[PDB]
């Protein structure tokens, strides 16, 4: 399954989402290498990840190494785990770092564990053609560092063009937060987005942002930045209707 994404060509009977363009996940001159089982594949900026071979509504794990060439030397920028959550009309990636380049000593590596979200893409629902009314309930997954078992629940009131949800069952209690009510605003590319506050007993503990995906607003996908006592923690978000 994971090895097929790195080696097998595109089949159209493969279930969507079939393609996920790696924009923010691989930067212009960098070179991201993904490994799973005995397979491995190299990606550049703008290349497509064969998400069709991956399982829907699950987190897929790849070992990764990020590299760029400076002068005439391949410095290893970053090493760790590359995560992908796949849905029918959306998908998002994340990087669990284990070592990063020593900025002040060329060729050296320093241990440092970060978790960040990479690329949130799919068939963006245009803001102008959203459901003109009604109420849809999205249910899915919230995943952070070393935890892919938190539950996303979100509801969108398309009449009021509002939205609210919460996160539950993450192992870290600071992270199971409420996603406060917020507006559905248009993006610069007219994508339908929702930017709101993270709450935790009705007080500011961060912020979140979701995009609506699918021609019928079937799915939402985004990320939550949650202020904690030990710094910011990034959580991936993805949910779908029934």
């Amino acid at each position, epitope marked *: 399954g994971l090895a097929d994404a790195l080696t097998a060509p595109l089949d159209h009977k493969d279930k969507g989402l079939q393609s996920l363009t790696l924009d923010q996940s691989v930067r212009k001159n960098e070179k991201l290498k993904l*490994a799973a*089982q005995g397979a491995e594949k190299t990606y550049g900026n703008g290349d497509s990840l064969n998400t069709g071979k991956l399982k829907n509504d699950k987190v897929s794990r790849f*070992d990764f*190494i990020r590299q760029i060439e400076v002068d005439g*030397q391949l410095i*290893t920028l970053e090493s760790g785990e590359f995560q992908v959550y796949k849905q029918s009309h959306s998908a998002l990636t994340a990087f669990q770092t*284990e070592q990063i380049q020593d900025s002040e000593h060329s060729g050296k590596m320093v241990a440092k564990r970060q978790f960040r979200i990479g690329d949130i893409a799919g068939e963006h629902t245009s803001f102008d053609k959203l459901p003109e009314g009604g109420r849809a309930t999205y249910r899915g997954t919230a995943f952070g560092s070393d935890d892919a078992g938190g539950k996303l629940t979100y509801t969108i009131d398309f009449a009021a063009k509002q939205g609210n949800g919460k996160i539950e069952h993450l192992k870290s209690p600071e992270l199971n937060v409420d996603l406060a009510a917020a507006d559905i605003k248009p993006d610069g590319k007219r994508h339908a987005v929702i930017s709101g506050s993270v709450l935790y007993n009705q007080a500011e503990k961060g912020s979140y942002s979701l995009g609506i995906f699918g021609g019928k607003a079937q799915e939402v996908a985004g990320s939550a930045e949650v202020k904690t006592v030990n710094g910011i923690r990034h959580i991936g978000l993805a949910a779908k209707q029934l």
Partner: antibody
Amino acid sequence: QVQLVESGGGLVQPGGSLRLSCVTSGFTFRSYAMTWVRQAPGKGLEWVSSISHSGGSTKYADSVKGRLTISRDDSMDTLYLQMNSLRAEDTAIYYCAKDQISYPAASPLDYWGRGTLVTVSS
Amino acid sequence: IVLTQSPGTLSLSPGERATLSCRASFSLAWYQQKPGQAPRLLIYAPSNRATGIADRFSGSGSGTDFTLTISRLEPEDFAVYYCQQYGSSPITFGQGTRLEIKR
């Protein structure tokens, strides 16, 4: 204060099986790739296998591929090498080594164990 | 990538400068192995040194020609040295080079 300790080496019949263990200490095992390197008697070093920090990606040299399987248990900080269909040219001292980064076979080996001897003959 | 270390043996005195060459066909590393002991990491690209490795050792070169330079030989520095590329699978080692004491 990193220390690697190999064990499980010994005498093996051609075609037999052996399992090597490399119990580690002094570092966070779960964050780094591990590597097996072997040295035939009187000759140089030869890379055998490497496993990622997660165990989700393994690499082998073509001369041992399919017959040797690398594995790890993070809860026990132990690295394994399951050696099957053991041939005479597999006779060597096998060294377990730690990589500098989590991705397998893409970094120097900064710490080595003291090796274990595997002898394959009739 | 086949690596060839020339020459095979180097007979030097203490306090003398040692030049060890490793040819390619980057990122390369160097290891030291004393009689009856396991190998150890010496330097790595470009010339970073492992913990407990004195400034005597240094590396240079790009393209194909890579060099390990020991400025002042010490009696403990007389051993076998293996070069090793990692930025290209499969991992390959050099055949080695002895440093023996001159007399």
